[PDB]
Amino acid sequence: EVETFAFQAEIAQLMSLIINTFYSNKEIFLRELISNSSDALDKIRYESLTDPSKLDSGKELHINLIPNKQDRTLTIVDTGIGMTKADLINNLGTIAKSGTKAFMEALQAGADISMIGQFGVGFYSAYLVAEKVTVITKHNDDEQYAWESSAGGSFTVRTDTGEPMGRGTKVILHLKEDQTEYLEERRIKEIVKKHSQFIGYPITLFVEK
């Protein structure tokens, strides 16, 4: 059972600005997704201080970067707090509405797309490099869900049947044809070292076979 939803108008507007604006410094997408993973890990770490059973679904707090040249995908996996169905469908998009409006006003004032993180909507920078984004997520209080969008104004959410995650979030970037440089080990290392060197969780860059 796949449910289809319309993005809020302001968020659809942000995604098409991200997709259509000429902007060469696309690598900042990785910093934004890693920062998102770091916050999700902070959240479950804090919550587990007052309730250790919240780590029954997995004690390890880490971030994995998994390129796959065969599928042309880059996956960012974290074992953070995860996202409920209400998060995916409504809550997070609602929060993002005000940061979207502020971000788009700043861009009129001379700001540039690399400051998207200061407005809390860094996730959508994924569409600098991806034609389609799949997010698999599991929160302790909900089931495993798959969110997906190729932009164009709509996203889908379904219950996920694949491998159980335990807890956390997996962002699968289906890369545009001319953005395969972000599948290369030396390029990913360069970006992580430049923008994410002080992230307080182990970041493991997988290599391909």
Ligand X SMILES: CCCCNC(=O)N(C)[C@@H]1C[C@@H]2C=C[C@H]1C2
Residue from 19, 92, 106, 199 touching ligand X (CB under 6 A): that is 92
For ligand X, give the closer residue by CB, 38 or 179: 38
In the bound state with ligand X, the residue whose beta carbon lies nearer, of 25 and 94, is 94
User: With respect to ligand X, which residue has the nearer C-beta, 121 or 183?
Assistant: 121
Q: Is 147 in the site for ligand X (CB under 6 A)?
A: yes
Which of 84, 100, 125, 169 is close enough to bind ligand X by CB under 6 A? Answer: 169
The answer to whether 36 is a known ligand-binding residue is yes
| CB count in 10 Å sphere of residue 34 | 22
Q: Kindly provide the residue ranges of all beta strands, DSSP E only, lying in the chain, ordered along the sequence.
A: 3-6, 63-68, 73-78, 130-138, 144-149, 154-159, 168-175, 203-205
Separation of alpha carbons 19 and 71, rounded Å: 21
The residue from 88, 136, 173, 175 that contacts ligand X (CB under 6 A) is 88
User: Which residue in 61, 63, 93, 148 binds ligand X (CB under 6 A)?
Assistant: 93
- Binders of ligand X among residues 24 to 43 (CB under 6 A) are 36, 40
- Give me 121's structure tokens: 């909507």
- The residue among 207, 17, 203, 204 whose CA lies nearest residue 128 is 17
Pairing of strands 63-68, 73-78: antiparallel
Question: Least distance (Å) from ligand X to the CB of residue 7?
Answer: 9
DSSP letter string, 15-60? HHHHHHS--S-TTHHHHHHHHHHHHHHHHHHHHHHH-GGGGTT---
Q: Which residues belong to the annotated binding site for ATP?
A: 36, 78, 97, 123
- Interface ranges with ligand X (CB under 6 A): 36, 40, 88, 92-93, 96, 123, 135, 147, 169
